[PDB]
Amino acid sequence: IFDINGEYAQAFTGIPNVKHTILEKKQQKGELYSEEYYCYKKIPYQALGFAGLIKLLRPSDKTQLPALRNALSAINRTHFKSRNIYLEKDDGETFLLYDDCRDTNQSKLAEWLDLLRRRRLKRTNVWPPFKSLATLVAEFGCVAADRSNGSKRDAFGFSNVLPLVKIIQQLAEDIRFKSIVNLNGGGELADGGTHWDKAMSDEVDYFFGKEKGQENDWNVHIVNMKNLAQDHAPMLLSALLEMFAEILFRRGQERSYPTVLLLEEAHHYLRDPYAEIDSQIKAYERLAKEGRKFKC
Amino acid sequence: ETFLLYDDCRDTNQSKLAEWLDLLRRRRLKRTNVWPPFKSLATLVAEFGCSKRDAFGFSNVLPLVKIIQQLAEDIRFKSIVNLNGGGELADGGTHWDKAMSDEVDYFFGKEKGQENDWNVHIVNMKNLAQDHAPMLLSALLEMFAEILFRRGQERSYPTVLLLEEAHHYLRYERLAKEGRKFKCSLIVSTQRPSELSPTVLAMCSNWFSLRLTNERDLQALRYAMESGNEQILKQISGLPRGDAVAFGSAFNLPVRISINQARPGPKSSDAVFSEEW
Amino acid sequence: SLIVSTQRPSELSPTVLAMCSNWFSLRLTNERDLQALRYAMESGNEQILKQISGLPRGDAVAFGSAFNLPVRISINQARPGPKSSDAVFSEEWA
C-alpha cells in the first residue's frame, strides 16, 4: 500500500505478521500490536536517476545540454579534491596551484578525454559530495582554449550561465527537502569488476524484494508521511515508477513475484498540472502495460 | 587530407572547415562501403548547426538532438532496433531499393516465380512496447505498400493477412485502398470499434459482431452499413458467448450462427494463484 | 450534359443532385442515403419507395419529367457487357 495522507494507521491495529514503516529489530507472535512502534527510512539524492536528474536540471538554454551531459558523464574518471583544482600528471611530478581561477596546463583536456574513452584510467571509489556536481557544472563552459600558443577569455558565456548556476545552486540550498536525506554513508563494495550489477542489485533486493525460492523478512511495505511538498512530492512519487518499470522489464519471465498495489489519490500526483514534460506519461503507461504481463 | 568530426562542439581549424562543408555540399568526397551508426546523423546535425559565430543560431536545434540523446540509450527501444551498422554497401545510387527489397522479400513472402520454404509466417511480439509499436508497424505497412506498387499485378501472388487487436496499429492509409488493386486481403479483429478508422470500416464487405454493449460502439457501426438490415441490431446487446451475427455477401439472409470449437485451442495462459504456492 | 454514377448519395455535393431532372434508384439499405434521396423526392409517391429498400437484383424505379408515370422497370442484359473481372483466388491456388 502506497499511502499519501496519514489516516489509515488508526484502524490497522492488531494484525499478525505485518511489517510496518513510516516514511533491524523484528517482533513476532506473543506480543501485542500497538502504536508508537514506528521506523524511519531515508532516500539519497543519487536514487533519483540519470533521467530524473536531467529532468530536474531542465536544460532549455542554448548549449547547456552538452555541458550537463559531459559533466554527468565525467564522474567515474575525474580527479578532484575538496579545494585543490589541479591536473594530475602522468609522469609523477606535481605543480601545485591555488584557489584562484587561472588558466594553467588545461590543454590536456583532449588527452584526458581520449584516455577516459580508452578506459585505462584510475577510477574513483568514494561517495561523491553533492557540491562536486555543481563544481563540475561550473567548471565546463567558462574556459575556451585557443588553437595554438594563446588563450581567450569570454564573459558572455559566464553571463549566460549565471542564471544557470543560480537556478541550480539556490534551489539546492533549501531546508524543506533537507530533512529527508541521510548522509551517514559507510556502505560496502563488492569486487570482481561487475560492480555495476551490484549498484542496482542492492536496492532491487532490499527495497523491492527477492525472487522465488529465497527468503525475505518483510511481507507488507507501508509508505506514509505527513510532510507534503506542493511542487516536489509528485515528482518524487512518480520518480519511483520509472525505476520500478525498469526493474520489472529487466526481471523477465524467469523471475516475477506477485504484487498488489494500493496507490491512492492518483490525480494529485499521477498527472502534475504545472509540468509540461510528458516523460512520466509513458512511464506509468509502460508500468500499466507491465502489470498485465505478470502477476501485478 | 584527414579530418575528424568531434562530439563536444569542438572548434578546431575553422578556416579550412568552410572548404570541407562546401565539398560535402557538392559531394566531392570518397564513397563509404560500410553503414555508419544511427548517431552519425546526430553528429552531422551538430556540425551543421553552425568571421564570427553566434550561439543564438545554434540554439535552435537543441530539441531534436536532446530527444535523440535521451531516446537512443533506452534498453526498451534498443531491444528492438539493430544499431550495429557497418553493413556492406553496393556501388551506385540504388542502395535504398536493395535494403528495402531484402527485408520485404524475407518478411512478407517472395516475388512470383520463386519457390518458398514456408507457407505460414507466425510472428510473436509480446514484449514490444506499445509506445513505439504503432509508428514502426505503420512504417512497415506503408513500406510494404510502396514496394507492392512497383510490383504490379503481373508479378504478384495472392496474400492473406490476419491482424488481432488491429485498432492499436491500424492508424500510412493506402494499403487498404490498394489491396483490391494489388491482390491483397485483410481481417480486422478488435474490441473497441469506435477507435477504428472511419474509412477502413466502410470498405469492409462482411461483418461479424459478437456481444457489444457500449452505445458509442454500436452508434458508429450503425453509421457504416452497406448491405445489412435493421432487424438484427436488437440481438447484439444480448449475444451469448460463442454466438455471432453475420450479414454480407455470403448469406441470403442474416444468420445467427453458433461457432464450432477448433481443437487445439490457442495459447490461453491463466495465472493460477494457488498452484504457485 | 452529365451522368452521375455513385453509391453514396451523402458523398455527393447537395446542389448537383437537385439539378438532375430525372432520377433512378436501385436497392439501398443505408437509411442515411435513403433520407438524403427523400430530401429530393417527388411528393405523393410512397408505395414505390418501399420497393427501393427491397428492390431485388437488377430492378430500377423510374420517376421524373421524361416518363408518363413511375414504373418498376426490369432492365435487360446487353451483350457484350463490361469487363466484370472479379478476380477469383481459387483458380490461382489450384
Please give the alpha-carbon distance between the first and last residues of chain A.
13 Å
Q: Helical residue percent of chain A? A: 25-40%
Total of DSSP H or I helical runs spanning 4+ residues of chain A: 9
Report the portion of residues of chain A in β strands.
Answer: under 5%
Quaternary structure of the protein: part of a larger assembly
Q: Which class do the helix and strand fractions of chain A yield?
A: mainly alpha
What overall geometry of chain A do the principal axes of the alpha carbons give? elongated
Strand order of the largest sheet of chain A: 1-2
Number of strands of chain A: 2
Rounded to the nearest angstrom, the radius of gyration of chain A is 24 Å
> Largest interface: which pair?
A-B, 25 and 23 residues
Order of helices and strands of chain A: HHHHEEHHHHH
Sheet with the most strands, sense and barrel status of chain A: 2 strands, antiparallel
Task: State the main characteristics.
1% strand, 3 chains, 296 residues, 9 helices, HerA, two-stranded antiparallel ribbon, part of a larger assembly, immune system, 2 strands, mainly alpha
Description of the structure:
In chain A, helix 7 (233-251) packs across helix 9. By secondary structure, the first copy, chain A, is mainly α. Chain A starts with 49 loop residues before the first helix and ends with a helix. Chain A has helices spanning 50-57, 64-73, 109-118, 130-139, 155-172, 195-208, 233-251, 266-269, 279-293; strands spanning 144-145, 151-152. Chain A has a two-stranded antiparallel ribbon. Chain A contains nine helices and two strands; from the N terminus they run ααααββααααα. The interface between B and C is small, with 10 and 8 residues. The PDB classes it as immune system. The entry lists the keywords HerA, Sir2, NADase, ATPase, Anti-phage system, immune system. E. coli Sir2_HerA complex (12:6) bound with NAD+. Chains A, B, C: Nucleoside triphosphate hydrolase. Organism of A, B, C: Escherichia coli.
